[PDB]
Amino acid sequence: SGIVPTLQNIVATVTLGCRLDLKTVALHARNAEYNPKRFAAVIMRIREPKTTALIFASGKMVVTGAKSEDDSKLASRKYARIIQKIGFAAKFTDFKIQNIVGSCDVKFPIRLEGLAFSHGTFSSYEPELFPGLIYRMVKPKIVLLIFVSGKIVLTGAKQREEIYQAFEAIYPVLSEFRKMSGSPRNLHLLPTTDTYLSKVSDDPDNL
DNA sequence: GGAAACGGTGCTTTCTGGTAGATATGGCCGCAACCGATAGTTTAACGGAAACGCAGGTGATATGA
């Protein structure tokens, strides 16, 4: 419970309001990869923040590799500004984080068979083609990947607090699977997602 | 006190020609029936559309293979 989870990847999307010519967009970006022989879209990485991004002719975009809530909106706004420099209106709309990926380490090894046998209502553990166990948390809804080393991965979340709540909910379970710190201090010590996102310009006129 | 002689004409009769219905035979016209044919199901079984499931353009957390 003392080893607070770290975010590894935040993935988001934004609507542009207007349908646009993706070939025209592909002409001016300083990083771009695109070939209709394999896929009909441009892959578009940037230096700072270190995000990858994607654009669709229908007037929608996706952003990946964000380290913070801030990076997600700030990168999306900078990609939209590049499209506004180009011959399109690109009205920044529908900003959302569809998935969050985080990880933590309890520093003790886990008997995945014991976890799967006792919590089989939520746990799945297939024959060992892959070494890690998977867990389906239903309230709040989170997917957790459990490894024998004590390393843990969390995904399927969209709100920051639920990743820390899911870790805190399974830490007592993991701690029971032991043989021969445990205090969270608070459920969420850091500021909320909204108090982070509000540092970035929200108004679409603030290009 | 009446019946027998027989003149009146009222009432009736067949010989016939009229009125006119009848039908054996005949020739058109069209109804009753058959073998015929066109259209009908819904399924052998697989040709079809809509209905159906996995990939690929990033990324990449674990620790084994």
Residues 6+ apart with CB under 8 A from A14: A60, A61, A63, A76, A79, A80, A92, A93, A94, A95, A96
Amino acid at A69: E
A133 — phi, psi (to 5°)? -90, 150
Residue A111 CA and nucleotide B1 C1' are separated, in Å, by 183
Q: Burial-class residue A188 by CB neighbours within 10 Å (0-12, 13-18, 19+).
A: middle
Residue A156 CA and nucleotide B5 C1' are separated, in Å, by 168
Q: Which nucleotides of B are covered by protein (CB under 7 A)?
A: 56-65
Resolution (A): 3.8
